[PDB]
């Protein structure tokens, strides 16, 4: 019968629940500085994380998991989600040339050359460049990002593990449907699935770097770089166990 969606599609849902881009409300009328750029980005991160929660609750099945797992998943991948979304906007808005934290706030050549900016942004640019190299479609992107939310669980699973794996497998399939939809030639359907899933696995490695740099800054009043209420609680939250080896990073490929 009539379509698009008179009988909605799972990926159709993700498309409509995707939160819209927020603007940092940065004052570029006055000179920049590492300290000011980062602070503005942290505040932006707070609001983006807040939106991520509203987004996660709209993902079918997510909020059927124990409420604690819902909290765990977000705390274990808020960086992955934000960094991945960042790379996406960078790839789409400027072919991964620049980092587009917000369409009105771009880390250009001038800002990239600031003191500690490049050592940080470096890992972010990587995900953007990767999305551009593989020409990731919007749909594949929506599925992949959802999978990032379910990319890391505790070393003892969650209180709704059975349901979790079921949701994750559901979106792994969704990713496959996006790959097939994107093309007609099934020749390299599995080859692309390997690349995309490989990229997801690499997110753990980039998150670790971004996170080490997130904690080191958070715990350094000398640096004077503010974090909003939202991020502060999550950083102080994870900071202890994001080192001792409490989290189990799920991977599509072992190697």
């Amino acid at each position: 019968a009539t379509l698009p969606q008179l009988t909605p599609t799972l990926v159709s849902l993700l498309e409509v629940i995707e939160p819209e881009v927020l603007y940092a409300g940065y004052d570029s009328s006055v000179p920049d500085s590492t300290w000011r750029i980062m602070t503005t980005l942290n505040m932006l991160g707070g609001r983006q994380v807040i939106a991520a929660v509203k987004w996660a609750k709209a993902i079918p099945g997510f909020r059927n998991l124990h409420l604690d797992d819902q909290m765990t998943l977000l705390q274990y991948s808020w960086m992955s989600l934000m960094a991945f979304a960042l790379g996406w906007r960078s790839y789409r808005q400027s072919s991964a040339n620049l980092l587009c934290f917000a369409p009105d706030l771009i880390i250009n050549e001038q800002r990239m050359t600031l003191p500690c900016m490049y050592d940080q942004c470096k890992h972010m640019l990587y995900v953007s460049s990767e999305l551009h190299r593989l020409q990731v479609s919007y749909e594949e992107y929506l599925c992949m990002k959802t999978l990032l939310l379910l990319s890391s669980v505790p070393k003892d699973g969650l209180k709704s593990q059975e349901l979790f794996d079921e949701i994750r497998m559901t979106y792994i399939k969704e990713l496959g449907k996006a790959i097939v939809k994107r093309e007609g030639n099934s020749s390299q359907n599995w080859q692309r699935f390997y690349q995309l899933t490989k990229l997801l696995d690499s997110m753990h490695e980039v998150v670790e770097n971004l996170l080490n740099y997130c904690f080191q800054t958070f715990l350094d009043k000398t640096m004077s770089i503010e974090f909003p209420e939202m991020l502060a609680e999550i950083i102080t939250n994870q900071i202890p166990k994001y080192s001792n080896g409490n989290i189990k990073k799920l991977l599509f490929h072992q190697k």
Partner: peptide
């Protein structure tokens, strides 16, 4: 054992429980 999580982020917990409107 012990669930030491008791405290850490009542803000998120709060945020995840109420969206009708």
């Amino acid at each position: 054992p012990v669930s030491p999580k008791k405290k850490e982020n009542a803000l998120l917990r709060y945020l995840l429980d109420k969206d009708d409107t």
